[PDB]
Design a protein around this ligand. Structure first.
Ligand SMILES: [Ca+2]
Ligand SMILES: [Zn+2]
Length: 455
């Protein structure tokens, strides 16, 4: 990672998600980068849960988020929850008003906007401290949307959105943590600035900066270093789980860390991806294939190998001279775990998809010809297979085959049979289903269920 600017004394960073649900890949990037810089600079990392929008809080997320961070391997030093800090935001609203940096605006929003867009001040902007403080206190008994606190910025700012932006609003809704205790809530740019300052954040790594600068200015605070990186290319998902067509936060159709973990994607793969992309200023474009590539490099060195025949067809090897005992390593680089032994006696299951007529070599076993729907023995050796132009195919002895299924990344179910040794696997094991893909065992027999990672 590139060096941080203006480092003086201890470095303090934060990761600040909203509790709208568990973490997704986008979150992982901010979490990893901030964690990596805290490690690099021997500094601290603050987890700040930004739950100041009562209608957008998922109660389960408070526990899910730190669990997801642990999964990623992120360590941190303090956990702060914004809904525990309401009186702090109120305190600093009063201070900001006393310093002449904010006012309570009771204008109709559209009438205010018309003035604002022409660089003209509303009457509220001219009120004094005690006048504003009285209006502020009144907000606590007013209706949703009836008054706001606005930060005094520049009414002639080139960017209209930065012109006297809103720091506090009234919302009449039950918060899942604090219930109906509060109706006056901070807007993100206010609570973020106040918390970054009070918690001692030195470097912010993730319009907004420009807005917050006015707050720091008015309060007499030095802002943190701001470092912004390019885009890489939750509420909709939560709705889906509630309605249907998502089984949960770990449904493979979702980009949550939970869903990808369930498929056997390693957190190390995610960390490596985010680190190598770094704090690149320019927009980057990662594909899932990029993540799969990193994961494959990890799994291919250790994942145990088995034959799973999807949509199997049961076929007699007609003319087999006699039984053939086949040995094949569980992993060619790890002799310690030994070899599978497959007993070819008469019938086999072959994967049925795109199974056309012609010569085949059942891996490590025998060469056959499939035609007219019949599988006929040809020979046994590798040279004969080359002479035939036989295509390699995985296979399962019929006598000892086990039922299995694999849930694919679109949540579709692929049914088939797997070789007997697969019964040794336990939930969480991640294996290579040869010539099919890597997959994590999600539930054990009878009837093993795997979740597909990638080819
Ligand atoms: Ca540290
Ligand atoms: Zn006004």
């Amino acid at each position: 990672l590139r060096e941080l600017a203006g480092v003086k004394g201890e470095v303090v960073l934060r990761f600040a998600p909203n509790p709208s649900g568990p973490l997704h890949i986008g979150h992982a990037r901010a979490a990893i980068l901030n964690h990596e810089y805290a490690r690099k600079y021997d500094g601290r990392l603050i987890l700040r849960i930004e739950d100041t929008d009562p209608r957008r809080v998922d109660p389960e997320a408070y526990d899910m988020i730190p669990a997801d961070l642990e999964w990623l391997g992120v360590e941190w030093d303090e956990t702060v929850i914004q809904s525990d800090r309401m009186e702090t935001y109120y305190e600093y609203t009063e201070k900001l008003i006393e310093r002449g940096g904010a006012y309570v605006c009771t204008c109709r929003p559209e009438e205010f906007r018309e003035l604002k867009n022409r660089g003209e001040a509303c009457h509220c902007r001219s009120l004094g401290f005690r006048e504003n403080l009285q209006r502020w206190r009144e907000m606590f008994e007013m209706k949703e949307g009836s008054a706001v606190v606005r930060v005094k910025t520049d009414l002639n700012h080139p960017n209209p959105a930065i012109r006297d932006w809103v720091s506090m609003r009234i919302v009449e809704a039950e918060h899942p943590r604090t219930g109906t205790r509060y109706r006056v809530y901070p807007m993100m740019n206010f609570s973020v600035a106040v918390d970054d300052h009070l918690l001692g954040v030195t470097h912010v790594l993730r319009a907004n900066r420009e807005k917050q600068e006015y707050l720091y200015r008015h309060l007499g605070w030095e802002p943190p270093e701001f470092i912004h990186y390019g885009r890489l290319k939750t509420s909709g998902a939560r709705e889906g789980i509630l309605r249907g067509e998502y089984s949960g936060w770990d449904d493979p159709r979702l980009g949550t860390l939970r869903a990808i973990a369930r498929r056997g994607i390693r957190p190390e793969a995610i960390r490596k991806l985010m680190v190598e992309i770094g704090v690149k200023i320019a927009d980057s474009t990662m594909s899932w294939k990029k993540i799969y590539g990193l994961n494959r490099s990890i799994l291919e060195e250790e994942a145990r190998r088995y034959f799973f025949a999807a949509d199997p067809v049961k076929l007699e090897v007609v003319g087999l001279p006699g039984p053939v005992r086949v040995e094949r390593p569980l992993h060619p680089d790890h002799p310690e775990i030994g070899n599978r032994v497959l007993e070819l006696r008469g019938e086999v299951y072959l994967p049925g998809d795109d199974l056309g007529e012609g010569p085949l070599r059942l891996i490590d076993a025998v060469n056959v010809i499939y035609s007219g729907g019949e599988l006929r023995y040809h020979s046994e050796g590798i040279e004969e297979a080359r002479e035939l132009g036989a295509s390699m195919i995985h296979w399962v002895p019929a006598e000892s085959a086990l039922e299995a299924e694999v849930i694919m990344p679109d949540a579709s179910r692929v049914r088939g049979v797997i070789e007997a040794d697969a019964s040794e696997l336990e939930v969480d094991d991640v294996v290579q289903l040869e010539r099919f893909g890597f997959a994590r065992l999600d539930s054990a027999g009878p009837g093993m269920v795997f979740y597909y990672a990638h080819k």
